[PDB]
Each structure stands twice: as structure tokens, then as C-alpha cells.
């Protein structure tokens, strides 16, 4: 009811930053209670929209605010490098937690089941379907089977070495190709989330710099302790 | 009581982020459980100190983490602009509650304590003393008191319009004069708290960029929004 369209969630989120609340396993801070506190900060300090992992952690938060929610399961699979939302299960949990979006690894790697069937599953729900994609040839998949939403979440996290630097090309592809595109993924500063922004993105999700206490601080403390060093 | 002297301390603090806890006044956030939750995140995380808001903050994070805390009590005052620990009860509240270092106000403002009587009864109590300063004279007020850790975190909060860069000069000043300097105020990005360091301080000292999550928030938003508009 929030939403009648994609166009106009993608009206709502142009130029936004969305929230990633998803802090570090096995902290102190990865606790329902907190992840509902910093939604309810960043709502209100003006964020429009956000993205949480786990069907309960989508409940509670969904019930605690009011901006629309990008929702994800993250699993540890056997057999499969796969590891967001890759159940029916887990995206029928996630619709009937209350989220607005669905987001899934849309990579053709070796998985339970085949993306087609989770795409499927979310276009059932009425909620929106996001592509987490790793590559152009993901988010042109996506796209033929009518998902709304295509980001470049894991570009960089599906082979060798992790670059340190976001994928721009990727949402510069994915924008000129007239996808709704949402540029995710490393986007560790204000300036490079607005790049993203410039690059062709309707939005930019960040995680880490904003909701990953341990690892902000160690940012700052590699860049502190090797400046002490070089005094030295 | 506190032990240690104030070389090793130094030792120990060069090249450090030290961890400034203090979250948006009135936020979901500001609760003692989650100030002791980031705490022991960022201990977790290699941070190796605090700065905690209120005694029973500092109480209830001493007894959660082993790093040392540097105390204050922050009070707006009907009668004073001076914020920062301004009454030797809350110098005793401080110590008593666990803190290593006591830090205070060192302007040179309408005050209900004259900062000489603040100082010294942080030096009755055996923790080291702070001069949170706001000018290069507080600092050598300071030092001519016994003093042992002068910062700049005063700097731009007493006069009108509030820089938004570090004051990079008063740092290097106090490092010049031979202090223990710690930089605080601004500080929001690793490159930035590096530059410190290499101005001369021994440790900075970070909160908004870590622990106001509403802050960064919109430091994320400001660009992205403003990119957005660009665009159309």
C-alpha cells in the first residue's frame, strides 16, 4: 500500500543513502535489540530506507519503523558458495516478516536452488525483487526474469581477492542499460557513495562504514598506528 | 587507584584511535547497555582506550572492558558555558567509578570551580589529569599546573560558527611545546586522524565519526542527496 509501483519506490529512493544494519557476528552488538535502535536512529536522522538480514531481525525492525525494508537471509550453505536469501523458505519468511524488498544472490554458481525459482518466489509475494550481482551478465539475467532491482553487492566477493575499491563500472553498465540500479559494495565514504550516485545509481546501500563499529575503528586505527609508525 | 606513570601511558597511546562513546543526546542509542556494548566491541577491535560520558557510564564500562577510560561528566550549567567535568564531586564520581584518566575543561570561562581546583582534585585522586582546551594558553596553563595530557578538544566550541576542519595548528603547537597532545575535535576520517599523528600527537581521540550513527547518517545522505539533485 506504501508503495503502488516500482517507480514510485524509485522516485523515493533517488539520491538516498540506504542503511545496511547488519553488525559484526558475534559482537556485542549483533543483538535484535540494537539493530532495532539504530533503525530507529537512522530513521530518524533522515534515512529512507534500509537493509536488514534475518526474518525476526526484518519483524522487528518492521514493526519499530516506518521506511520501507530490504530484506535478506544470510546462510552458511554445504554445498554451495551461495549465501543470501538462496531458500523459498527464507524469502516466504522475509514477505511475511514485512519487507518491501528481497534481495538474493543472483550469480549462477552452484546453489539449492536455481535463482529462477527464488526470483519466482519474491514476484509471488508482491514484494519487490532485488539482484545482488557479482557481474553485468547477473544483472541482465535478472532483469529478463522482471526484477526490479539490480545491485552490484557482490561484485568483488565471488572469486579472487577482494578489491579494495567499488565496482563503478558496474553500476555505470547496470544505469546505462536502464536498470533500476543500486550500487552496493565498499562504498566507504560520503564521496564515494555520491560518486556512485553520479556513476548512474538510483541509491547507494552502505553497510560496514556506517553500521560495523569494530570494523570502522579499525580503519581508523591502521591509518593512526602507521602514522605512528612513520614518525618513528 | 590508578598506577601506572604517565611515560607509560604515553608508550602505550602513541598511534592510538582512542574511542570516544558518547551517542546522540536523547537517541535510542544513549543507554548505558549499548554504551557498554560498543565498548566492548572496540576493545574487541583493537581500540586502546575510551572516552565515556557519566559516572555510572564509566562505571558500568570498567567493569566490561580492561582499557583505560578516560572520564568526564558533561553538564549544560544555567549559570556557566562550561561543559566538560565541572565540579570536583564528579572529578570523585569519575575516579570512583573506575576512570584512568579524568578529563576537564581548561578554559579560562565563568566557571562554578576554578579549573586550578578541578585539576588538582583530579590530581588527589591519583588518575591523570586532562586538559580538554579550547586555545594554545589553556594548554600552557595547563602544563604550568602538572597537568599531564593537554587536548584540543575545546577547540571551535567556544566562540560562534563552528569549523568544520580539525584544528590541525593547536595540535601541532602543544606537540611543539613538548605536551602530551592529544588530538580531539573533527577528527572524521582515518586520513584525517593520521594527520594528527603526524602533527604531532601522540593519540587521537574520535567520536562522532565512530559512535554517532545518526551523524554519519547524514554526512552519507548530505552527498548522496546532493548528487541526486545534480543529476536532476
Same mark, same amino acid.
Given at each position: 500500500k506504501n508503495f503502488l509501483n516500482i517507480e514510485e519506490l524509485k522516485r523515493f529512493l533517488n539520491g538516498q543513502t540506504v542503511v545496511?544494519? /547488519?553488525?559484526v557476528t558475534g559482537s556485542p552488538l549483533d543483538k535484535t535489540d540494537f539493530i =532495532?535502535?539504530?533503525? $530507529?536512529? =537512522?530513521? /530518524?536522522a533522515g534515512a529512507k530506507a534500509?537493509?536488514?538480514e534475518g526474518v525476526s531481525n526484518v519483524a522487528a525492525v518492521s514493526a519499530a519503523v516506518t521506511i520501507p525494508i530490504i530484506g535478506i537471509v544470510k546462510r552458511d550453505l554445504p554445498d554451495?558458495? =551461495?549465501? $543470501?536469501?538462496p531458500f523459498v523458505s527464507d524469502v516466504d519468511g522475509l514477505a511475511n516478516a514485512g519487507a518491501t524488498v528481497i534481495a538474493f544472490d543472483a550469480t549462477n554458481r552452484t546453489r539449492p536452488e536455481s535463482r529462477e525459482r527464488i526470483a519466482q518466489a519474491i514476484k509471488n509475494t508482491g514484494c519487490f525483487a532485488m539482484a545482488d550481482c557479482s557481474t #553485468?551478465?547477473?544483472?541482465?539475467?535478472?532483469?529478463? /526474469?522482471?526484477?526490479? $532491482?539490480?545491485g552490484s553487492t557482490l561484485s568483488g566477493y565471488v572469486g579472487d581477492i577482494e578489491p579494495t575499491v567499488p565496482d563503478f563500472q558496474l553500476v555505470k553498465a547496470f544505469s546505462?542499460?536502464? #536498470? #533500476?540500479?543500486?550500487?552496493e559494495g565498499r562504498y566507504n565514504t560520503p564521496e564515494l557513495a555520491a560518486k556512485a550516485i553520479e556513476s548512474g545509481a538510483v541509491a547507494v546501500t552502505v553497510g560496514s562504514a556506517l553500521t560495523r563499529l569494530e570494523v570502522?575503528?579499525?580503519? #581508523?586505527n591502521n591509518a593512526t598506528q602507521a602514522a605512528g609508525e612513520r614518525k618513528c
Open positions: 545496511s544494519i /547488519q553488525p =532495532v535502535a539504530m533503525a $530507529i536512529a =537512522v530513521e /530518524q534500509l537493509r536488514i554451495s558458495p =551461495v549465501r $543470501i536469501t #553485468f551478465e547477473d544483472g541482465l539475467w535478472a532483469n529478463s /526474469q522482471g526484477v526490479e $532491482i539490480v546505462e542499460a536502464g #536498470f #533500476f540500479t543500486m550500487a570502522v575503528t579499525q580503519w #581508523f
